[PDB]
Nucleic acid binder design. Sequence first.
DNA 1: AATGCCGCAGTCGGCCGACCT
DNA 2: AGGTCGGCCGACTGCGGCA
DNA 3: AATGCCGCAGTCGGCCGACCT
DNA 4: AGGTCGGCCGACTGCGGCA
Lengths: 49, 49, 49, 49, 262, 253, 262, 253
Amino acid sequence: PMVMWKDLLTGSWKGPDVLITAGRGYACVFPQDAESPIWVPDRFIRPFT
Amino acid sequence: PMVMWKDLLTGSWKGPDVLITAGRGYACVFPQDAESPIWVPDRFIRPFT
Amino acid sequence: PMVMWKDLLTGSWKGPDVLITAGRGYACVFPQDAESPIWVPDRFIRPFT
Amino acid sequence: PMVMWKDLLTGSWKGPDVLITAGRGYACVFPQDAESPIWVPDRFIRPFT
Amino acid sequence: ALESAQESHALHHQNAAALRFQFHITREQAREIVKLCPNCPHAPQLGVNPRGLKPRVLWQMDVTHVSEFGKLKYVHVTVDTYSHFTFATARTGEATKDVLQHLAQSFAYMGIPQKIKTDNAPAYVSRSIQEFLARWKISHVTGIPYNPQGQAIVERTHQNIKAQLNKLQKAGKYYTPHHLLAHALFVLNHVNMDNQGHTAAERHWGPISADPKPMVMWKDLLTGSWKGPDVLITAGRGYACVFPQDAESPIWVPDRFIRPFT
Amino acid sequence: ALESAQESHALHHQNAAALRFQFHITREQAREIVKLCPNCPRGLKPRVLWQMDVTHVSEFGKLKYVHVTVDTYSHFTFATARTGEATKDVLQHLAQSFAYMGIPQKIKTDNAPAYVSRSIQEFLARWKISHVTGIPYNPQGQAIVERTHQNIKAQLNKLQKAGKYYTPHHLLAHALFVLNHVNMDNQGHTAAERHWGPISADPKPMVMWKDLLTGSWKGPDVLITAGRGYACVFPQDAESPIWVPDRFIRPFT
Amino acid sequence: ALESAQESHALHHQNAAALRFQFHITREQAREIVKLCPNCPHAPQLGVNPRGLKPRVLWQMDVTHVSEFGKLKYVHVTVDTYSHFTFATARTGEATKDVLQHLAQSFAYMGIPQKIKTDNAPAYVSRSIQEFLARWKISHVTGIPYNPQGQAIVERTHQNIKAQLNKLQKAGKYYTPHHLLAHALFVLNHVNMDNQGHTAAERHWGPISADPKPMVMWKDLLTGSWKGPDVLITAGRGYACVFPQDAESPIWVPDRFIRPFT
Amino acid sequence: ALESAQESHALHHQNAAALRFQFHITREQAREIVKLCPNCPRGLKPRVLWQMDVTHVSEFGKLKYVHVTVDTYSHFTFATARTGEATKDVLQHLAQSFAYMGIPQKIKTDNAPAYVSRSIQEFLARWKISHVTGIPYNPQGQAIVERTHQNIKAQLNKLQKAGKYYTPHHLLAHALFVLNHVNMDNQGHTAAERHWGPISADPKPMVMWKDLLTGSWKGPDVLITAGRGYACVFPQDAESPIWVPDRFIRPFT
DNA sequence: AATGCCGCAGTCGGCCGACCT
DNA sequence: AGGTCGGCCGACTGCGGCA
DNA sequence: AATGCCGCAGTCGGCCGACCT
DNA sequence: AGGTCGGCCGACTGCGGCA
Ligand SMILES: [Zn+2]
Ligand SMILES: [Zn+2]
Ligand SMILES: [Zn+2]
Ligand SMILES: [Zn+2]
């Protein structure tokens, strides 16, 4: 599965990207483009496709 | 798992079929129909009965 | 003009007496009692009857 | 009558000051310290005394 | 007594609630104690930005900064406040002639108002603008300096235009900045339909129509009292308009001052 | 009143119809105002078939390529003083005409490359606009563009007595404004009005309004509402509705 | 059909409402058409910052910048998330020893938690801090980097502290910055009373006076379904907590996911 | 378990009572833990009468002027290592004691100028604190401060085996923490606890908790709620309440 | 001298169609 | 033929963020 | 690797006291 | 003695702005 997601740090809107997990106020995204998993608030996650 | 969902595009109940995951009130439905995964709003989910 | 107001400090109706002005739901009550003008919430105003 | 009032331009909170008028979303404050009348919106006015 | 409540308040600036329990006083007594505190500095809906009663009455105008096009960022925007009919011109500045360019175009695009409201920029204050207004016979409101809400209709419109431009730019390439902009304007007034099934253009120049309205009680903040009841002209998200037989002019207030009369 | 009729005539030079409908001028008097001026000698639905053409306003000399789109129904004229006859110049004009006029069902152009391009055909497909080839030239289509070009130029000529424009676009836009929003037909309607098409079987009542400031009936004006012995009418040039004791109102039929 | 609705949407990015009327489709169909727009882009209440279930469980800590005192602007702040019991230390920096100073003081002032949450600053990440946590046996949460809401309790507290310091400074002169601060802390926990008639200190060290609670339906966003009904533990402005027999741990959610069961 | 009892003893050096109440240690064993350690040899309401005193902790030498305030009820000790005995030093200390302890009904000091100042008297009026003049010396009041100073110093001496403090304040604060929040009396209560005064006729039921992970009874623990055949109890060191089948719960009396 | 707004996309309640009784 | 239920659709609402 | 908050000060509805019937 | 009304008070809500 995949999602869209806001870059909490710079504010730039990112995605679509590799959805790893989510729930209870959080989400995890992780492309192999990234060095490590993207751990963000679920308020910035949109249900891509 | 095998859950049925209202076809967001026609209204017909589809499945029950391969649900991949869920979160934030959505259900990422995605069987072998590679055309698109579908995050279906939870209210339209009716698990295999 | 001569209007009566609930004593915001004791609850007793005071006056009717010299109202200077009003606006935004308040009534600036101010007779010769130089101790303080009083913007009384409109709901506590009862004009001379 | 007198009121407190926020400096719309710099954001500094001003007052207490000379109330000239008010109503329908607007107000006027005008000390002789000022060159001309202070025309501000009701939303920044507090019922001083 | 209250004197000691005030004393304690002056000393520690004690919470009104605490004062109630400590001094065995009412909430309202406690509220006055803290209200009279000059050292103790809340902003609920109060005013409202009014609008025209029919198309071509009151327009609102301001500019923005669409950095995407460099110098062309100076987009001039005019909106019919009644119908929310929008118009924009990507100029390369804010010169008198850029204002006038936009205006000329807006006269062809929108038509002609009875009055127009702008901000307090010199671009509108200038005698040359006032001259133009005198020639075309249009009233000019500048609003309160530094209060962006005087231009709230066009600012909200700017959000819409911006978003529209973003979507459309992502959708493909355009020959010019104006090609994109025109596409957006087209959509905003002729494609984008409201919840009544009508377009902005349609509202701007549609058939004269009106629906019957109920009487409501109307609170006048200058008297602190409920007046009427009388037939409400209109309303929308957060606002309402009424014009009584005994009133001098139409009354625009927030809709929280409306109490539907039985 | 007619002093200001003359004033606005000097400013825009609108026709006799517009002058008299606004100021209640004797048709003859309105014509007098005009002749004394130093520069003043289809289907059933709008947005269906548009007539396209391009001219050469030498007065500009650079923007002379004025692209023109005319609603064959209302005769509404939209024009863009372009720098050439490229397919992109056409498309740019077209995009602008969408903003001003909207999207038609079909458009009639000539057979120039400026319209032929498949990229344009693509756009026509995108906007579901059927193309009329312009091959069947005749006095109807010709009169549409001929009258249009003459009318445009006439207004532009009128504005040569007030050459206070910075660009050709300031000039043209002003002209187009008058042409579509100021000048009136014999029924008092404008080209824009007709183009828009709000004119239909309007069920709203109109009343004669005794303007008590004059002691006489004006209008008829569209009535908005009524109650408690007064009627709320909203006149053309009024800024707001006016409550008037019912006895001074005359339901107009 | 929907194909042409999508076509037009792709072309102009037409309003879902407009699509409904233009193509004679349902709202939800129109909504999906616009939802699938890759070039098109709302943030309702979703997450919630949870808190301790009793005093001395979860604390929250961060710093602020009270520029009034120059170097002393580095005020370290710790709050008991259960009782909202606050503590602050005006230090001249964010060194290990300044963090520690505050901590030492907060151990004497507040006591000791099971766990504490800070932001992701190096001032807390440092091994030496991690050592202190090992010495004192306290769990450490850092939250998501750059998301200020992870420290929302103390940030909200900072507003209160700031305001308290302001009104007290207006009230007179103080011997030291600490004189002022201590006065503020005094008020915040021992003077300022809540709407239940209790002080923050009182709540912090008061005995667990538990009240009986009703059963509610609880929506789990990971299943998209209503569960229970079961007894709600607590709630407040915008939030709620429930802990079912079949649950692994206490559940903190926004109170819009609560539906009181009859 | 006792290994960590010993660990925390090394860290804080809490008394035998604290050790055994937390770890369920034989009183004798708890005393053994203590003796083997290299540095371990009123009215009815709190916040009423406080005992004030100042000492000279030469170990600091600059902050040696430790101002001390003791709740005569709970024997809670608050202290501020000041740089002198000025009236402002006293007031600064006092302000800090308000934050930690609160405001009393009266405070007993000696007759030093450090307390005499009318500015202090003013402050006492502001806070309605009656002043006990402390003119006579009395073994009772003397024992309060004597025991206090000895206890403070004892803890400070204990912490000399782990002199890893940046300031005297880091050291003292740590000491005070242990003195008021860690050490327990014969009933398992702390000075802070007593100072606070939450202890009263607590109507809440406690239950024995069969901790099924061990298969044994723990507590008794304060019961929070119950339903559907399970009870929700929340133990001292538990992070959260625990649902346990009623049959494994014993209403404790 | 005048004064916040409105689209998004969820969410609730009601009206009507279909189907069970 | 009347009653029960789903669903189908309008109506209304928290939210952010333009200056 | 976890997740907005809560005081201000208005505003509404309800409960109870006083006084009229 | 019961009914009507004021008022007296708790409870709930839009708002802003902390980072
Ligand atoms: Zn105060
Ligand atoms: Zn003329
Ligand atoms: Zn789109
Ligand atoms: Zn020891």
